[PDB]
Design a protein around this ligand. Structure first.
Ligand SMILES: Cc1nc(N)nc(-c2c(Nc3ccn[nH]3)nc3ccccn23)n1
Length: 819
């Protein structure tokens, strides 16, 4: 009764009932629910109670030069508040919070929490290595901390608990509601590669079509590898329906018996085409009925090395594969070659696979190599179905620190879509790291929940993983998650209702919104909740007066909240946009790559001032967007002066009038230069550079940033318009334009050092979140195969294209958004 009620809370928290067995043909999901019990308990029993409660957010990376140049006399100042008294203290960058606390005790046990935030400076780490400190230095802000009690670890209380050939019988297909022809195609797939293919005879396409044909494949039973898929597709010639069935299940048993599989409808490659899940809609979907009842030369070395050196998108010829395989032992000495090598494996040949597993027993070089995320991610994509191969990637991932896990978390969750089985090393890894650390666990929740809400293809899998995490995260976080879920469900209903009620926000609309928000505040809207994109902030009451409906196409809600923390230094509100219509999954992915790009630039001592705003997709074409404060649209700035034609002087004028002093205006101009360069490089590489300037914003302190990334004739590589160059003092060249060009080149070249990582992430993004030719764009953008000097000029030329095209492209967009 109590256990049954606890499951209902989980169901409401998850957004899917994991105990549901209406859409299964076996027990893989249950087996996985049972399988994850140990991994969960083990991490729960192993984590340090104190450090888990306080979740310090630290890094082992060096402090970049641009942050060292901001600290003088090897002295960082910290302000310590208590009750109504605060004192500034001189602290060395190398000091530990424990050593700092002894100073504020001798000078005249407690813990140092960040003022206005659930964020604690604790543990055996130098204060320079705390993220919040690094954040403070970055923005020239003082470190305000409060001396108070460590949270009670008791709050994280966890509740106690054969030589024959293979063949398939195609009985027939049926559709509830449909003179063309139709045929069934059956494929034995492994890692995108097709091992064997058979076809039924084409028949008239009616509501029921029977074949009763044994389709005999050329592959033997013994030759079938683990993770092999029977992929069943229906062509009428165009594809209409597909469904998959693992030939060897979770218990290493060959699949036998009768199956009636409800298939997926088609809207080139897509992660959804790989799913082992069946269509839950029995009432409306097509189904299929089946029956199963069964040492080297110098020239070659150069040839080999060339292959290894090619990018992850360069396809291998049979010649290249036969070369890699024959010299596998030599290939094994090169971590970089593992993806290509393991793609040269004939997986439909048992004795070859045996050799492959023996080859993986000689992993000395792999184990010893420095972790390479791009390389590691390559082995976790759709090209690799083998659990043993995939496990060596997850093994490399084990050495990542929390800081780094957070950088890659989203696409690691997405990568689970490429796993053949519900239980996998990667699933256990994510489960492990989320239970170890509250921040990773917070975002894991939202990432898993995002897919569960809008992916029928993977919700079952992801829902099982989420239940596993929620059963170990502890009572306190379960309370936080519940609070958060209640708030967003409430505000999503309001979002859709207002939208339902001409792109002119009428008087009666503004009235209705104010009404609905007041009625929530009084009723069940909890006094406070963690901000989903910023788990360190607690949002209090709605600041109703400041809430409005935006005069945009999709009519999004502009919401502002009080901070629940009374120790907050400011009276700043928390701004959240709730929107329906944009696919915010696409925003999430792009934003995540932007953060990775920022971390790449830090390693070369660059700060290009990107503003990768918080964003959490909560369902189909719906979610939340962090409001960047003091920010307006480049279009609106043009609208206010001109109306509808574009003037060059306007933007530089805007920065002047929004600046109090000359010193700050110079700082605003510098930030523009750095941030404009940052977005020019990032967007160009990503193929999202050609944007209408309604989708480009700038802060009152000069920080340019792109927004609304979902769903992306004269063309432009990026947006560097005449108004942008006028701020830089050009119409010719300038000290600011020279610096802009200098930053661009350095930023462009810095990304190219990480070519493989970017190609893979972009590649995975398109497969999980959006053909081959779309993916290949990034190779040309990253000028693979070209030296640096030649690459420098390439991007220099892209700047010149923008200068030549002036206002043409922008003007065209304006016309396009006038129909
Ligand atoms: C990150 C951010 N900050 C601000 N101030 N505004 C927005 C924003 C956005 N952002 C956004 C991100 C993704 N879709 N939309 N859309 C609108 C529409 C009207 C007015 C403002 N916005 N986004």
């Amino acid at each position: 009764e109590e256990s049954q009620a606890f499951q209902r809370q989980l169901t409401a928290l998850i957004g899917y009932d994991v105990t549901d067995v209406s859409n299964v043909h076996d027990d893989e999901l249950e087996f996985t629910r049972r399988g994850l019990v140990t991994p969960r308990m083990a991490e729960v029993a192993s984590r340090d109670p104190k450090l888990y409660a306080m979740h310090p957010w630290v890094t082992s990376k060096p402090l970049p030069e641009y942050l060292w140049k901001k600290i003088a006399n090897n002295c960082i100042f910290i302000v310590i508040h208590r009750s109504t008294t605060s004192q500034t203290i001189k602290v060395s960058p190398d000091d530990t919070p424990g050593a700092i606390l002894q100073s504020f005790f001798t000078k005249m046990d407690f813990v140092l929490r960040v003022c206005g935030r659930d964020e604690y400076l604790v543990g055996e780490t130098p204060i320079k290595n705390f993220q919040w400190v690094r954040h403070c230095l970055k923005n020239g802000e003082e470190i305000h901390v409060v001396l108070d009690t460590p949270p009670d670890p008791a709050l994280d209380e966890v509740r106690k608990e054969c030589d024959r050939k293979f063949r398939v019988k195609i009985r027939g297909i049926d559709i509830p509601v449909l003179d063309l022809t139709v045929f069934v195609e059956a494929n034995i797939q492994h890692g995108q590669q097709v091992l064997c293919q058979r076809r039924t005879s084409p028949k008239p396409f009616t509501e029921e079509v029977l074949w009763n044909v044994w389709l005999e494949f050329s592959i033997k039973i013994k030759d079938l590898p683990k993770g092999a898929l029977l992929n069943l597709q229906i062509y009428c010639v165009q594809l209409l329906y597909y469904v998959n069935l693992l030939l060897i299940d979770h218990r290493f048993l060959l699949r036998r018996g009768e199956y009636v599989l409800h298939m997926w409808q088609i809207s080139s490659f897509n992660a959804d085409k790989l799913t082992s899940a069946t269509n839950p809609d029995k009432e409306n979907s097509m189904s299929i009925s089946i029956l199963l009842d069964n040492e080297m030369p110098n020239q070659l070395r150069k040839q080999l090395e060339a292959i290894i050196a090619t990018d992850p998108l360069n396809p291998l010829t049979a010649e290249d594969k036969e070369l890699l395989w024959h010299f596998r032992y030599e290939s094994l000495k090169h971590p970089k070659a593992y993806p290509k090598l393991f793609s040269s494996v004939k997986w439909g040949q048992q004795e070859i696979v045996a050799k492959t597993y023996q080859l993986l027993a000689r992993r000395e070089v792999w184990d010893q190599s420095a972790l390479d995320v791009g390389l590691t991610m390559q082995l976790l994509d759709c090209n690799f179905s083998d659990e043993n191969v995939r496990a060596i990637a997850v093994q490399k991932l084990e050495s990542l620190e929390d800081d780094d896990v957070l950088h890659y978390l989203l696409q690691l969750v997405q990568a689970v879509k490429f796993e053949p089985y519900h239980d996998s090393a990667l699933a256990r890894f994510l489960l492990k790291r989320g239970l170890r650390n509250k921040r990773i666990g917070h975002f894991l929740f939202w990432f898993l929940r995002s897919e569960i809400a809008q992916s029928r293809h993977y919700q079952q899998r992801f829902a099982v993983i989420l239940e596993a995490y929620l059963r170990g995260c502890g009572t306190a976080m379960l309370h936080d998650f519940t609070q958060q879920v209640q708030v967003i469900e409430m505000l999503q209903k309001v979002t859709l209702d207002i939208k339902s009620l001409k792109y002119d926000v009428s008087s009666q609309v503004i009235s209705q919104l104010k009404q609905k928000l007041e009625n929530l505040q009084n009723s069940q809207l909890p006094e406070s909740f963690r901000v989903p994109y910023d788990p360190g902030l607690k949002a209090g009451a709605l600041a109703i007066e400041k809430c409005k409906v935006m005069a945009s196409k999709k009519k999004p809600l502009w919401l502002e909240f009080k901070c629940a923390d009374p120790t907050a230094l400011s009276n700043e509100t928390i701004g959240i946009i709730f929107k329906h219509g944009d696919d915010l999954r696409q925003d999430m992915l792009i934003l995540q790559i932007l953060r990775i790009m920022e971390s790449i630039w830090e390693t070369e001592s660059l700060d290009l001032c990107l503003l990768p705003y918080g964003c959490i997709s909560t369902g189909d074409k719906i979610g939340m967007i962090e409001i960047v404060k003091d920010a307006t649209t480049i279009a609106k700035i043009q609208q206010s002066t001109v109306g509808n034609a574009f003037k060059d002087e306007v933007l530089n004028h805007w920065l002047k009038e929004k600046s109090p002093t000359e010193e700050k205006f110079q700082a605003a101009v510098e930030r523009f230069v750095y941030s404009c360069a940052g977005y020019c490089v990032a967007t160009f590489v990503l193929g999202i550079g050609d944007r209408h300037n309604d989708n480009i914003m700038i802060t009152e302190t000069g920080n340019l940033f792109h927004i609304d990334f979902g769903h992306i004739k004269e063309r432009v590589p990026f947006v560097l318009t005449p108004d942008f160059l006028f701020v830089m003092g050009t119409s010719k060249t300038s000290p600011h334009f020279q610096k802009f060009q200098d930053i661009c080149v350095k930023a462009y070249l810095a990304l190219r050092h990480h070519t493989n990582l970017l190609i893979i992430l972009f590649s995975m993004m398109l497969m999980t979140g959006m053909s081959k030719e779309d993916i290949e764009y990034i190779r040309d953008a990253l000028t693979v195969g070209k030296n640096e000097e030649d690459a420098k000029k390439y991007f220099l030329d892209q700047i010149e294209v923008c200068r030549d095209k002036g206002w043409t492209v922008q003007f065209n967009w304006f016309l396009h958004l006038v129909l």
